[PDB]
Design a protein around this ligand. Sequence first.
Ligand SMILES: *[C@@H]1O[C@H](CO)[C@@H](O)[C@H](O)[C@H]1NC(C)=O
Ligand SMILES: *[C@@H]1O[C@H](CO)[C@@H](O)[C@H](O)[C@H]1NC(C)=O
Ligand SMILES: *[C@@H]1O[C@H](CO)[C@@H](O)[C@H](O)[C@H]1NC(C)=O
Ligand SMILES: *[C@@H]1O[C@H](CO)[C@@H](O)[C@H](O)[C@H]1NC(C)=O
Lengths: 320, 320, 320, 171, 171, 168
Amino acid sequence: QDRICIGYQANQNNQTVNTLLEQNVPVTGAQEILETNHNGKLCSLNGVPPLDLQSCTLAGWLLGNPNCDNLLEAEEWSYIKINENAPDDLCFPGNFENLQDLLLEMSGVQNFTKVKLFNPQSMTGVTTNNVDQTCPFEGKPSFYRNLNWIQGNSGLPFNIEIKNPTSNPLLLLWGIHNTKDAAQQRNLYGNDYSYTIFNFGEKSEEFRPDIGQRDEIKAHQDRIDYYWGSLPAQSTLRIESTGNLIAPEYGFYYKRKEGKGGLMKSKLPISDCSTKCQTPLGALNSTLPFQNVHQQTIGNCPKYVKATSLMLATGLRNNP
Amino acid sequence: QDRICIGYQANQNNQTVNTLLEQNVPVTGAQEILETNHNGKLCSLNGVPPLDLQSCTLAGWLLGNPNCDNLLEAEEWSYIKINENAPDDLCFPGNFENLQDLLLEMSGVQNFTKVKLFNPQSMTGVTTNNVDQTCPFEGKPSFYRNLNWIQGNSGLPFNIEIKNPTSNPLLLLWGIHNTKDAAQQRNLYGNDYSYTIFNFGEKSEEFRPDIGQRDEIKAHQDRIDYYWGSLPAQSTLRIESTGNLIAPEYGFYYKRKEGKGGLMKSKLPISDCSTKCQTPLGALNSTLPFQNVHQQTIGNCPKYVKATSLMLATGLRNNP
Amino acid sequence: QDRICIGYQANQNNQTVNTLLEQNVPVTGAQEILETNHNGKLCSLNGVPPLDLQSCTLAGWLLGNPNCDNLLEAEEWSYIKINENAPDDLCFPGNFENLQDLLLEMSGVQNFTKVKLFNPQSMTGVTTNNVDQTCPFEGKPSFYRNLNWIQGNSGLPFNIEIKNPTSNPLLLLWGIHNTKDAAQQRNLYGNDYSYTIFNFGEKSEEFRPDIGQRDEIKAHQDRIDYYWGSLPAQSTLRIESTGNLIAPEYGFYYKRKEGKGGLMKSKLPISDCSTKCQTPLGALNSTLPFQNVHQQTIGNCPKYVKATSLMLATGLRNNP
Amino acid sequence: AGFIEGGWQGMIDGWYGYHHENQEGSGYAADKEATQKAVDAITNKVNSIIDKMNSQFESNIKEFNRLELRIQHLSDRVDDALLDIWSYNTELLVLLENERTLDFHDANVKNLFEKVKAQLKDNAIDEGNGCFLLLHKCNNSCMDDIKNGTYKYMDYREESHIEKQKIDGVE
Amino acid sequence: AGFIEGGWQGMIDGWYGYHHENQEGSGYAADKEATQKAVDAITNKVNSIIDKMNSQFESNIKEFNRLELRIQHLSDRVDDALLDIWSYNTELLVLLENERTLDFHDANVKNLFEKVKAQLKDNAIDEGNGCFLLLHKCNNSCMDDIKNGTYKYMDYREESHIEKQKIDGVE
Amino acid sequence: IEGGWQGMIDGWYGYHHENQEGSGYAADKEATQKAVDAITNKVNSIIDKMNSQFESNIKEFNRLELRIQHLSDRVDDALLDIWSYNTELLVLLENERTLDFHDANVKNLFEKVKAQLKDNAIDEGNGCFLLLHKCNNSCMDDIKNGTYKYMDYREESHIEKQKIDGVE
Ligand SMILES: *[C@@H]1O[C@H](CO)[C@@H](O)[C@H](O)[C@H]1NC(C)=O
Ligand SMILES: *[C@@H]1O[C@H](CO)[C@@H](O)[C@H](O)[C@H]1NC(C)=O
Ligand SMILES: *[C@@H]1O[C@H](CO)[C@@H](O)[C@H](O)[C@H]1NC(C)=O
Ligand SMILES: *[C@@H]1O[C@H](CO)[C@@H](O)[C@H](O)[C@H]1NC(C)=O
């Protein structure tokens, strides 16, 4: 007998998919919409390399720890790779104030350029560029490159005027010298107590030393409290101090990439590659909507889901 | 021959919808479920108008700047329109402490009424109602309406008790006078160093003047730190001071609308209209579930999506 | 004649469901996927009981308020029940610094064990274990169990070394005595002004008394500022002071359950029950994906939704 | 001149309907109850997608200074994550509901066709284009009985069998 | 008594079934393997909607003071954003799955009907109400052959052809 | 209806005729291409509609920010639960619909042929038509093409079915 039939394809595909009704239904074609592969590298984001601090911390680098003289001169970065146990941090012992906000503020910047803020040689009745064995450079007592330790004022005020004539903010770092006792306070700054006042228009901050013997470290019972600030565009900072001020000599003009920074804690080094999405485990080169590589991500990334696979059926039910 | 057919409607509708399977499918009917329009107004939120601090800042207004005596007497507001470049702020140079939290605290209030906190005339051994050229009222040296500059205590402690008997919190504002040097401190308050202590039960805050020459602004090398606080219902505040206190003379009872305030930065003026959803670009008069006008919204609003249209098919396939 | 029919089941079920197309469609069977029941109890989380600070606050218990000596010795807890106006808090009037973070840090811990930090009898030129009437233990002047009030140093410095040899952090609490006047300062510590310095490596904090008369509470015009800290594993804290130090005598080794604590404000007492999900109204014993009991939840819980029911049709359309 | 598999420009009066051809003339006629049933359902679906959104009172702040950076970073993250959720889901929701709405209309006109089929049976020939060639005479009274589900099979059985035999033979 | 356009109160033993009428009597019988296939599929659907939610350990705090107001604002924003997301998505999910579940049961009784139809062919008359008027004699052994998809067409062809000619007029 | 055909390649759905010439399979390429275009467009939709913000994740911190860290970690899990649950269900639903979509395509391919040979064939009840006449590679073809002429085989089919029963 003559006989015509209607039917559909079946092949040798072992792909199975799950549906709301049945599980592990064999199909002739299935698509994976979950990205599960990365390149195992720390890359540049869209061509912009991250900031590699190497043996230094952000603080050590910005302050200008002599051992950080080799980094160097990075103009822009898409994110920062943090080296946790970086040895080159604060060479002179002390506290860093508000480090976390500085981290956020520096997480992604554009036109980063160092600037000389004032000329110490213009100053009179004072000693400038003071050094210490604790901040050595090649077997000699040095100090932070971007800071200036001022002494010998004999209890008299000295003044520093800082100006930001650009349309970008100006990053400033400085310190307050916490003397160990009155005898050191008098010998260095010629008084028993000092004030240091930062003037941003009508706004002002006053700094006072916290005098007292700290437990000895690096032959120092005294400390330095390190501060940072941001002098806005077209603005002026005026400083007056009767001592204890480690002056800001070098600052940095910078433009921060709005809502486009990043802080990366990773053991991987930095490679010569680029990506639009980065994880601590490596970069994702994906056009897929979902990924299960890592939740902590930077850039334009697929959404992180708690799944091992997302098999989307395309083909037919494969039952011969 | 006799025939009967089954068919469907076709019309002249140019509307097309996208489906999971096909794109730009013509239809006889389609609904837009995405709000794309606003009325271009700053409206009241359910009949409750926003707060317009025109040329004054919130601080300037609440402190009683002599140029902010015209605003005025707004009992309630649903959100605050922020004028970032308001000229009338702090007429006496200094810092305002914790401005952001105050902005939040006052974002939406109901029964906002001013109260006299204490009577300066009842005080002895002291000068009250002290004025200054920097806070002028009609060509003459004045001071903040709601604050009272106390001096001439001759090193002796004075006391102020402030009681909140009502069932609502009470907003207080005050200042601390940062003298320029020991001479001015000795001269106004009869000592080298004062204390000012606020007492809320066993809880206390001690303020000290920060003495030192600030950069000269408005012929002042001294400053005032301005503080705000909130005295809970059925609570008593007791103040003792030996100088440098700019006393809180007028405060404000207020009831805050829980989880229902707002801060708005907009160049639009405040119109005489009402809405349930407010954006910086204008008000959303929408019963639709989604909008694409603005992400920064106040009120009961449609969800912000990144889409130009959401055409929901209702009609049939329009292929004749 | 002879006929056979195809048909479906109908029954006496009064359950209805809603669909995208129709509402209140009668069905032969439906499932609820919205949990709406709770047991009205505060329970243990997976066998781990919450922390019951009965008449005490967390501050009172950790400092060792004599009225908290009965609690006691809880090694672990899954979350904390904050008490409705606990009477036993700060027996000596004052301020507790950074309480909220301490609430967080302690919201869930594992190996909570008390340690003696130093031995007061080993100290010389000083008076230890001082008591006051404001901290009574059964009608007798006493003091905090875990703090040591040191006096009579005659202006001379005294030293305390705290070592944490374990692999878990060590919780420390101490206080700074804010004396009422210079006379009391001299009479207790033999100076006009003291320093207390905490050393953690190069990092240090300096504490100074805030001398001044507070309002008289519990026969005290002086106060105490209470502080807390976490000394990390394998670390050492060194303290030097010339007065005003309420020393840390007993601390707590603890291991925090990462991202797995909780703070519970409820009027319900603690019951002898267990659950995997806890609300202020009661425990949720559910395998269902959603709940409408409470938004504030602790543990592995169904998502909160703003719905009265979620009837999922399983059966057939029930039109007989 | 008859669909489906093609739309009737000038059906009007309804979404789904009939077109007849006999001795008295032609004419379209909408199935009002089947059209009204579908309108109610589609209206219900549209209202469900719209009315089930009852968003809370919320306020957004992006105007802010620097020194709380950490909070503003988190706040911006939440803003952007909320946007990605609502954007993606709503795109798919619309794409899905449009695919299903078109399927819904299809199933409605097919059932309409099936109802007629189950009435006529072998008294008609399935032209396979959505039309039925009647094997007998169907005046306007007969066309109405079909559209109303009251067409009686046996009343036209003999005439249809006889006409089918004409398509063959022979006596 | 003859439905598919209506539900059988007193079907029992299953979701989808048969009702026969012959010389020996009447009775309902559920198609167990088709019922069990739907019971399995529905069970899997309900389980999917329920078991695929695996929520993390999470703790919520709203008890808090003033001075972190900023943080409490964001925390409340997050809570409400999460609430709107889960409320709206779950409502729509339940509405959608109910519509499809109902369509799932319809398709099942419809395929059961089409299976019976493909066996009987012209040996029976579609009454248009989910019933088949058999053009021959069908004892209980015949009924069970149909319910078991074992009914043989040719074994009743002649008797049916005779019975239909009777219907088509013999004079 | 009994299952798919191993060795039916070069098309998703199609025909497998069997006359006196011989046997063999064939693919309905237009019906296949429609389905292939659609399923592709579905997959593209699920992929392309995902537009992602520039996101920056921070979870490295300390102990002096414990309130913000707690909220940040809470937001992370909540985002995790949403995207996990929703995607899982998206896949399950779409896999069910895709399979339903295939069954509908071959079934309409079946009903389009059945509509061409009304009386001229017996429905075997398994997607196969028992033709009541001789059908060579011009007949089986025109059925596939949609041009089969029901009248050009009417009388011969009636004779055959008459030979399937009695007569009076
Ligand atoms: C078949 O499945 C196995 C599972 O072990 C896998 O390794 C292999 O790649 C699959 N091959 C096919 C047919 O895709
Ligand atoms: C430097 O800033 C300018 C501003 O005009 C910008 O155009 C340029 O892209 C920046 N440099 C880099 C490397 O992006
Ligand atoms: C202030 O609040 C009180 C609540 O008791 C209310 O009675 C009163 O109407 C409010 N004032 C105005 C004028 O709205
Ligand atoms: C922590 O607690 C458990 C009891 O729950 C105890 O057995 C274990 O030894 C403790 N861990 C340490 C630090 O020994």
